Design a binder for this molecule. Structure first.
Ligand code: CLA
Ligand code: CLA
Ligand code: CLA
Ligand code: CLA
Ligand code: CLA
Ligand code: CLA
Ligand code: CLA
Ligand code: CLA
Ligand code: CLA
Ligand SMILES: CC1=C(/C=C/C(C)=C/C=C/C(C)=C\C=C\C=C(C)\C=C\C=C(C)\C=C\C2=C(C)CCCC2(C)C)C(C)(C)CCC1
Ligand code: SF4
Lengths: 33, 100, 153, 141, 67, 42, 80, 95
């Protein structure tokens, strides 16, 4: 399963990691200590 | 009632105001301190609501300005009809108005 | 024969360009009557083209592989007429203009409001100043030596 | 001088516009201007439109200080009346704002102190290298 | 004694932050009060970017030109 | 004519007169000496 | 918020204050000019930054001087 | 007094002057049937915890996305099919 690895990582970097980063950085943007 | 309501000789025809440039306003009828004076002269050139603050003089100005524009349009029409007269193939176009 | 360029009176591509343009004009000359006015204008343009190519032949122009007059602006005497003899004729005329408009600006520099002579040019003063720049190079030379060319702030 | 102690005075006759207090009044400060008009007349209010201020005392609540002072300058220059506006935070504590001494700021009233004032020409300010790696800037010495 | 230049003396400017820096001007008037920091009122032939031809200058921000 | 010579002395009127004369000069030169690329008169 | 610092080249013409649409500036008594007054700036926290004060300052360069700085809701011209 | 004639600056009632009115907020009671409400209150309580909902949505959406893309046969999306055609030569032989 090595021709299937692009199918794993292109969503995981391009859809999932952007959701993670956008959510985390939006929380960091609006935080207040 | 709707009278004629005109007045005789409100403005003296002379080239004195041709000489002094930017005569039509307070801050331009002094002379160029800078080169912005020229641009503000041409920019406020037809801003008749800025020159004189009454609708009488403004309305006379725009009326005679419309006459100048009509003279220009008639001159342009004369040009087109004349270039169609002496500098044209209008007869040859009438003879064959599909390949000429 | 400098820069690997055959002269234009000897270049076959130059004559081919001449013949091509002449045929292009003659193909437009056939549509008109031989005595008509468009035909006479086309024939005048044809003689203009022919003597233009002859004159580019005789004036030492060099033609490349494309077959077009190239200008050798390096300094070779054979081609001074391409750049330097016009160039001096520019720097004269240009230096006329700047020596006039400068001199005028010095002649209206000592007025009360000297800006109303920038937009309303004194034609007598300007006509007196215009021919001062005829022999401008000696005036500019001497004013450089006398220090009157550069303001001392 | 003692401030003027903003009362519950009436407001101009206005049919309502889309230029009022959206959220800068709910959670932040909003402003209020009071002017004594000798007669009832029409005036162009700064939030767009045209209101009719009443005779005697009037009160108009605006969203920021520039609206208040623009209206105030138009009042003082066109209707020649004496305006004075406040700033009301959403918990209260109405702050007297405009004259701050009773007389308008163009008049040199004594008592008001020199704040924001350098005793030097503008080009004698030190360079940024002098104040580098320091919280101060080149215009606070 | 009247301090500074005279009411028609020609002067040049040594103020770095001025429009007429290293440019000559005409002293309109000098305020004789020894408490005004910039008494020397100068008049210049050419306006600045604010379309203003005059400003008050200091005594040490000015230099009596020898012309 | 007084104050017409001041108007004709103004920068645009004077510029259009000078450049009309100059352009006619260049135009008639190019009629007389068309298609010039060298100065062969020395 | 902003930083409206003024300098001693002011002549007391009271135009910076008559242009100010937020009452940042106010003339105070002073002894450095013919007019015997100078334009302070207490309400710098109300400054929008419009620089009408220095588009009306008739000095060689400027006396009133707006240095744009930390922008608050009062300095960002916000009615919301 | 906010309810006076053209008085809109009651200082103690600063919610009516600032415009803190609920334009459409109805305080009317629960309209749903209480058993349906209890069902939804018990079955959706697991999703109430935010810090455990953000993590769950991240690690569930990414899981479902990296899974359904992996086991997607060559009928849904053509990128997982392949060329399914003889590869043509490029210009200049292939270069
Ligand atoms: C900055 C360098 C760099 C760049 C621009 C790329 C770019 C790319 N990689 Mg590669 N990759 C890199 C370094 C890089 N890679 C390294 C260092 C590794 C070894 C850990 C990999 C291992 C790798 C795999 C296994 C896969 C990609 C894939 C991809 C593509 C989609 C993004 C995902 O990847 C995920 C990114 C990483 C694993 C990098 C973490 C550091 C994209 C063309 C995918 C692909 O082939 O799409 C066609 C894929 O399945 N990358
Ligand atoms: C019935 C038609 C009409 C009339 C009577 C007016 C009248 C006026 N306009 Mg309005 N205007 C019009 C059409 C008209 N405009 C149109 C169609 C537009 C859209 C472009 C505008 C946009 C417009 C603006 C944005 C402004 C005005 C302003 C003005 C006033 C002063 C104009 C002036 O002094 O310039 C005198 C004339 C000139 C400076 C010459 C303009 C040169 C043009 C733009 C160049 C184009 C020429 C040509 C096509 C290009 C080739 C040239 C060639 C030599 C190379 C005057 C009240 C001004 C005003 O009232 O402000 C207070 C102003 O700011 N007008
Ligand atoms: C039935 C009579 C009549 C006619 C034909 C017109 C026609 C016109 N008027 Mg109007 N006008 C009239 C009555 C009339 N007006 C009255 C009674 C008033 C007073 C309330 C005005 C006030 C008025 C203003 C304020 C303005 C006009 C303008 C115009 C011109 C607009 C440009 C156009 O469409 O070009 C089409 C062009 C033509 C048809 C060519 C015109 C050629 C003929 C000779 C002139 C038309 C007859 C005219 C009334 C003069 C009568 C004889 C005269 C010796 C007394 C147009 C020529 C505008 C204009 O352009 O300014 C000059 C303008 O600013 N008119
Ligand atoms: C030769 C006759 C003559 C004379 C001596 C005067 C003299 C005067 N006129 Mg009158 N005027 C005349 C004819 C004349 N006018 C005509 C024929 C019209 C009808 C258009 C007017 C309409 C008129 C108005 C409405 C006003 C004046 C005003 C004035 C005064 C100011 C003139 C000035 O500075 O503008 C000099 C300007 C020019 C020479 C520009 C000429 C513009 C022409 C008309 C158009 C040319 C456009 C061109 C085709 C397009 C540009 C092309 C280019 C890009 C190559 C002055 C007393 C003003 C006044 O007293 O009010 C305070 C005023 O408001 N005149
Ligand atoms: C349709 C074109 C048109 C028309 C009718 C006018 C009409 C006018 N212009 Mg305007 N003007 C125009 C185009 C035009 N302008 C353009 C393209 C420019 C350049 C931006 C100007 C710049 C300009 C300036 C700077 C001034 C005028 C002025 C005038 C007035 C004087 C007329 C005069 O004395 O001429 C009579 C002259 C002839 C018939 C022969 C001219 C050759 C009149 C209102 C003057 C004005 O409004 O003063 C109040 C003025 O000072 N014009
Ligand atoms: C919109 C108005 C307009 C325009 C743009 C033109 C434009 C032109 N005309 Mg026409 N013309 C016009 C009105 C106009 N004309 C009118 C009203 C008349 C009657 C007096 C003429 C009579 C006329 C003649 C008799 C001739 C032209 C010619 C020309 C050309 C050169 C003119 C030139 O360089 O003058 C020189 C420059 C100045 C005078 C300045 C050009 C295409 C010439 C042409 O087409 O040559 C083949 C030509 O012989 N025009
Ligand atoms: C780019 C620098 C440069 C400069 C400043 C000059 C300057 C000059 N050259 Mg040119 N020249 C140059 C490069 C340059 N040359 C090159 C690269 C060549 C090709 C080898 C020539 C070929 C050349 C010829 C053939 C002649 C000059 C001549 C001259 C002088 C007239 C003038 C001083 C002429 C000369 O010697 O005048 C006395 C002359 O006959 N030059
Ligand atoms: C800056 C770049 C540049 C350069 C170097 C040239 C150069 C040239 N162009 Mg090109 N051109 C350019 C830009 C340029 N052009 C642009 C931008 C355009 C589009 C507007 C054109 C469009 C164009 C066309 C359509 C044509 C040219 C032509 C020409 C030639 C001019 C021949 C001529 O009439 O002069 C002859 C000399 C003069 C007019 C100067 C005379 C000056 C007077 C009489 C004073 C001199 C005497 C003085 C008193 C001193 C005497 C000494 C002493 C006794 C006192 C020349 C090779 C023409 C040509 O022949 O093609 C090659 C041609 O047909 N050009
Ligand atoms: C760069 C990364 C990236 C990746 C990997 C994808 C991947 C995909 N996109 Mg694309 N898209 C992207 C960026 C990306 N997109 C961007 C930046 C834009 C804006 C221009 C779009 C705009 C776009 C549109 C407009 C559409 C897609 C569609 C699709 C799907 C392919 C259609 C198909 O054949 O499957 C068919 C498969 C299905 C119909 C089933 C979908 C399966 C879903 C995605 C699983 C749910 C996973 C999870 C719970 C939610 C995400 C969690 C989060 C943490 C990421 C595929 C999942 C198409 C699609 O499917 O629409 C939904 C479609 O219509 N995308
Ligand atoms: C020869 C030749 C050449 C070369 C040359 C060279 C390299 C030169 C250089 C030169 C230089 C390096 C120069 C410099 C200069 C400097 C200066 C510094 C100057 C000044 C001047 C002046 C100042 C003047 C003025 C004027 C006049 C006189 C006129 C007009 C007006 C005026 C006023 C502007 C070539 C190869 C191209 C080609 C061939 C020929
Ligand atoms: S505008 Fe300038 S000179 Fe005038 S009072 Fe204000 S700071 Fe002083």
């Amino acid at each position: 399963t090595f021709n299937n690895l692009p199918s794993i990582f292109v969503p995981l970097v391009g859809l999932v990691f952007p959701a993670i980063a956008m959510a985390s950085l939006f929380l960091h943007i609006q935080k207040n200590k | 009632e709707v009278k004629i309501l005109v007045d005789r000789d409100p403005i003296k025809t002379s080239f004195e105001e041709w000489a002094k440039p930017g005569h039509f306003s307070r801050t331009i009828a002094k002379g160029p301190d800078t080169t912005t004076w020229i641009w503000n002269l041409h920019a406020d050139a037809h801003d008749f609501d800025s020159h004189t603050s009454d609708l009488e003089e403004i309305s006379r100005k725009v009326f005679s300005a419309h006459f100048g524009q009509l003279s220009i349009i008639f001159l342009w029409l004369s040009g087109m009809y004349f270039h169609g007269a002496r500098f044209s193939n209008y007869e040859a176009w009438l003879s064959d108005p599909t390949h000429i | 024969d400098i820069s690997g360029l055959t002269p234009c009176k000897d270049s076959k591509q130059f004559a081919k360009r001449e013949k091509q343009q002449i045929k292009k004009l003659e193909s437009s000359l056939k549509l008109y009557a031989p005595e008509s006015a468009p035909a006479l204008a086309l024939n005048a343009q044809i003689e203009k083209t022919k003597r233009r190519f002859d004159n580019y032949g005789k004036y030492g122009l060099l033609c490349g592989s494309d077959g077009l007059p190239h200008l050798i602006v390096n300094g070779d005497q054979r081609h001074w007429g391409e750049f330097i003899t016009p160039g001096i004729l520019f720097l004269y005329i240009a230096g006329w203009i700047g020596w006039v408009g400068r001199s005028y600006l010095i002649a209206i520099s000592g007025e009360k409001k000297p800006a109303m002579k920038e937009i309303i040019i004194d034609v007598p003063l300007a006509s007196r100043i215009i021919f001062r720049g005829f022999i401008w190079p000696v005036a500019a030379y001497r004013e450089f030596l006398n220090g009157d060319l550069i303001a001392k702030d | 001088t003692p401030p003027q102690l903003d009362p519950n005075t009436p407001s101009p006759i206005f049919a309502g516009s889309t230029g009022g207090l959206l959220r800068k009044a709910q959670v932040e400060e909003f402003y209020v201007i009071t002017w004594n008009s000798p007669k009832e007349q029409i005036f162009e209010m700064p939030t767009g439109g045209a209101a009719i201020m009443r005779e005697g005392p009037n009160l108009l609540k605006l969203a920021r200080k520039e609206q208040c002072l623009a209206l105030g300058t138009r009042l003082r220059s066109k209707y020649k009346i004496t305006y004075q506006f406040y700033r009301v935070f959403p918990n209260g504590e109405v702050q007297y704002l405009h004259p701050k001494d009773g007389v308008y700021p163009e008049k040199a009233n004594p008592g008001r102190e020199g704040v924001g004032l350098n005793m030097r020409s503008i080009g004698k300010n030190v360079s940024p290298i002098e104040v580098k790696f320091t919280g101060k800037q080149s215009y606070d010495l | 004694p009247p301090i500074g230049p005279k009411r028609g003396s020609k002067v040049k400017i040594l103020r770095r932050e001025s429009y007429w820096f290293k440019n000559v001007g005409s002293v309109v008037a000098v305020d004789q009060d020894p408490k005004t920091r910039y008494p020397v009122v100068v008049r210049f032939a050419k306006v600045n970017y604010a379309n203003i031809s005059t400003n008050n200058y200091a005594l040490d921000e000015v230099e009596e030109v020898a012309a | 004519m007084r104050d017409l010579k001041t108007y004709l002395s103004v920068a645009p009127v004077l510029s259009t007169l000078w450049f009309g004369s100059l352009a006619g000069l260049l135009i008639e030169i190019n009629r007389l000496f068309p298609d010039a690329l060298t100065f062969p008169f020395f | 918020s902003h930083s409206v610092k003024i300098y001693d080249t002011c002549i007391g013409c009271t135009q910076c204050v008559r242009a100010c649409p937020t009452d940042v500036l106010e003339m105070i008594p002073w002894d450095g000019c013919k007019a015997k007054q100078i334009a302070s700036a207490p309400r710098t926290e109300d400054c929008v930054g419009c620089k009408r004060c220095e588009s009306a300052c008739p000095t060689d360069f400027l006396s009133v001087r707006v240095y744009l700085w930390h922008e608050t809701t009062r300095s960002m011209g916000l009615a919301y | 007094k906010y309810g006076d004639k053209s008085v809109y600056f009651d200082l103690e009632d600063l919610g009516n002057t600032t415009g803190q009115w609920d334009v459409y907020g109805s305080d009317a009671p629960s309209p749903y049937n209480p058993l349906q409400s209890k069902f939804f209150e018990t079955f959706a309580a697991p999703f109430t915890k935010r810090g455990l909902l953000l993590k769950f949505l991240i690690l569930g959406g990414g899981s479902l996305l990296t899974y359904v893309s992996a086991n997607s046969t060559g009928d849904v999306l053509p990128i997982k099919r392949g060329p399914q055609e003889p590869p043509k030569l490029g210009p200049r032989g292939k270069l």
